[PDB]
């Protein structure tokens, strides 16, 4: 079971506060060092993961010489490379020299149900890591850098580029696969009759949504949904025959007159003469009672608490000229498609359900 | 003044704890996440220093549109970037939106006397940046990156591309910075009547160990004495009288008969084959009475407490093939050399004095 809303938002201030205690405990400098040298972190993870460690270390602690013999590594920099990482609280090294799983490198092992293995991966790619040497030329511009390293858009790439294409999808997985569960749980689908998934992809959302309310019916509205193994996984769920595929463009307007439009990680891919288009034609299709739900990591209007929006987004504007909004850059750009944002919904996890109705 | 090593170690111990119970009440999926994610934090320090944001801060607070044209960034990509350090403890957001100074931000200031600008510029050049992309073969195989990226030892790209030099001096000089005070302070410099600091760069430490010691006479040894500015800033710092300038090799026999030999960070860059053959060359021309310094972070014999020279000996490992050590470590070591451990010295920072006497 998840737990309120309100008891996450509290663990996270406590947890800002004692990060703030630490840094306060330590030479200003000091503290800048350690967050300057956070790449080498990074890279320590990203090959934990592509050496599948936390896998070989799932039946029993292995000493460096035995785990490094079974992924194909040097013992010594392995061994090296996992006292450093436990040292942050991912694998723990024993007084006998053996090194053993955390919770914490327990989310790398690929089948773990909330794994990060794949945003491991994808952050120590080589083609992601020359990505962000662009990063000084995109805050001077404000431009993403892709366009210009790569001659194309992110999407036109990553369809070129199958292989790393995958890569990248499975990074993006990594976080989105933790949505789902705290989104039913903060906001009643069932007072929806017929719900579009706007892009939805695969249909994850909308098996969760079907799912929680039995008496919705609903629509995957995607561009590759005949291809995307969107069939295969609905049926799985036991969905199938409450849902309908609709191979439609991100550009076109979505069949009308739903009683929910979900747009989750849709609108912070774009900049915002696209991500008003967008609002606009689903305004087009949506009829009084219609509700509009934006899945999105909604930064908070003020304050310097943590948020994982406010890491994102720079991430967005690096590849793709998007970002993250407040919830009054939200309203001020719902006002200009036609909608008027009702409230903010909040979850257990760090996504928020915006919540608009036409105008 | 710098306190007592035991308030050090009481922060030390304080900090690691709270971090503990920070990610004992995070999801350890999220936990991890944020490891994974500090390739980006480093970017957007890199960028704030690059932009020389603090700098442009010294006169007041100032929001992202004021800070545009006077650091010649976009106003937008500037303030998402600053809102994410602020999150950080690196500059502060104001409730009208402008950014302020923080005592971390004070420190990526060219001039700050402990300035982590050098090597925030360091850990965001292309050229490091690709370097770190060899890190996962440097676990597959042990073997330092530089020769297989580069066809040459690191150190000798750096002699032979002498704007990238720079930036590394400039990088390792701001770490370097913050060891000097701690040392001197740990460690009675009076009692020797000369010193040698092999291979001491500049004599930066040695400086501080002349005049810590009036009665000291110095000798500084390094392979670029005669064109690393040495003569320009011993000068100003009022010791050149006291400094005898050697030009020798890192494999040489340094002058002989010195009450002490000091060596900072020479024996971590070096595989034991070569790091021997320099204490070897030490243990000839030492003579009885004399003692061995090895400024060094030395990394504790048991447990995953945080140290930073668990993170720099990554470092090393991909860049030179050296490596940090334990105290039996450096025990068996030095042994190996003719010399015995004598004690290991702390500091009020993380770098210790490791002291030998030759047997």
């Given at each position: 079971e998840l737990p309120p809303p309100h008891v996450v938002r509290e663990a996270e201030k406590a947890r800002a506060d004692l990060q703030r205690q630490s840094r306060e405990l330590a030479p200003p400098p000091?503290?800048?060092?350690?967050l300057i040298m956070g790449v080498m972190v990074t890279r320590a993870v990203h090959v934990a993961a592509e050496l599948k460690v936390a896998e070989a270390l799932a039946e029993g602690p292995l000493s460096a010489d035995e785990l490094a013999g079974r992924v194909g590594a040097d013992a010594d920099a392995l061994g090296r490379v996992l006292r450093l990482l436990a040292s942050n609280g991912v694998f723990a090294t024993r007084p006998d020299g053996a090194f053993?799983?955390?919770?914490?490198?327990?989310?790398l092992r690929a089948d773990h149900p909330?794994?990060?293995r794949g945003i491991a991966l994808l952050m120590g790619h080589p083609i992601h890591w020359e990505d962000w040497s662009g990063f000084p030329e995109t805050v001077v511009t404000g431009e993403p850098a892709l366009p210009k390293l790569?001659?194309?858009?992110?999407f036109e790439f990553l369809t070129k580029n199958a292989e790393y294409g995958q890569v990248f999808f499975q990074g993006m997985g990594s976080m989105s696969a933790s949505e789902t569960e705290p989104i039913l749980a903060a906001y009643?689908?069932?007072?929806?009759?017929?719900?579009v998934d706007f892009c939805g992809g695969q249909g994850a959302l909308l098996a969760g949504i079907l799912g929680a309310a039995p008496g919705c019916e609903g629509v995957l509205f995607d561009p590759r949904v005949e291809?995307?193994?969107?069939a295969e996984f609905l049926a799985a769920q036991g969905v199938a025959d409450r849902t309908?595929?609709?191979a439609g463009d991100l550009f076109d307007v979505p069949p009308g007159g739903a009683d929910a439009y979900v747009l989750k990680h849709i609108v912070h891919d774009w900049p915002e003469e696209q991500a008003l288009r967008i609002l606009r034609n689903v305004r087009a299709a949506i009829k009084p009672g219609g509700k509009l739900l934006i899945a999105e990591m909604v930064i908070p209007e003020q304050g310097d608490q943590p948020h994982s929006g406010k890491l994102v987004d720079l991430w967005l504007m690096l590849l793709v000229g998007g970002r993250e909004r407040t919830p009054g850059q939200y309203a001020d750009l719902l006002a200009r498609a036609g909608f008027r944002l009702e409230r903010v919904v909040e979850t257990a996890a760090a996504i928020s359900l915006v919540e608009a109705v036409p105008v």
């Amino acid at each position: 079971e998840l737990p309120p809303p309100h008891v996450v938002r509290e663990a996270e201030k406590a947890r800002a506060d004692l990060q703030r205690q630490s840094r306060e405990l330590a030479p200003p400098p000091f503290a800048l060092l350690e967050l300057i040298m956070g790449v080498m972190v990074t890279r320590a993870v990203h090959v934990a993961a592509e050496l599948k460690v936390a896998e070989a270390l799932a039946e029993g602690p292995l000493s460096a010489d035995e785990l490094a013999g079974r992924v194909g590594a040097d013992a010594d920099a392995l061994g090296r490379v996992l006292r450093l990482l436990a040292s942050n609280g991912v694998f723990a090294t024993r007084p006998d020299g053996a090194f053993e799983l955390t919770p914490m490198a327990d989310a790398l092992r690929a089948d773990h149900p909330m794994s990060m293995r794949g945003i491991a991966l994808l952050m120590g790619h080589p083609i992601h890591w020359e990505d962000w040497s662009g990063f000084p030329e995109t805050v001077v511009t404000g431009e993403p850098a892709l366009p210009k390293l790569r001659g194309m858009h992110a999407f036109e790439f990553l369809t070129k580029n199958a292989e790393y294409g995958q890569v990248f999808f499975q990074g993006m997985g990594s976080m989105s696969a933790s949505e789902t569960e705290p989104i039913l749980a903060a906001y009643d689908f069932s007072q929806f009759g017929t719900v579009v998934d706007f892009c939805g992809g695969q249909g994850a959302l909308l098996a969760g949504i079907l799912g929680a309310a039995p008496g919705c019916e609903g629509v995957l509205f995607d561009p590759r949904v005949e291809e995307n193994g969107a069939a295969e996984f609905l049926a799985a769920q036991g969905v199938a025959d409450r849902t309908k595929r609709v191979a439609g463009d991100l550009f076109d307007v979505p069949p009308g007159g739903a009683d929910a439009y979900v747009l989750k990680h849709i609108v912070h891919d774009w900049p915002e003469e696209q991500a008003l288009r967008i609002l606009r034609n689903v305004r087009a299709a949506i009829k009084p009672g219609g509700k509009l739900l934006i899945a999105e990591m909604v930064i908070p209007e003020q304050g310097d608490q943590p948020h994982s929006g406010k890491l994102v987004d720079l991430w967005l504007m690096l590849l793709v000229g998007g970002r993250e909004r407040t919830p009054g850059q939200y309203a001020d750009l719902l006002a200009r498609a036609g909608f008027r944002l009702e409230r903010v919904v909040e979850t257990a996890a760090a996504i928020s359900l915006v919540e608009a109705v036409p105008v």
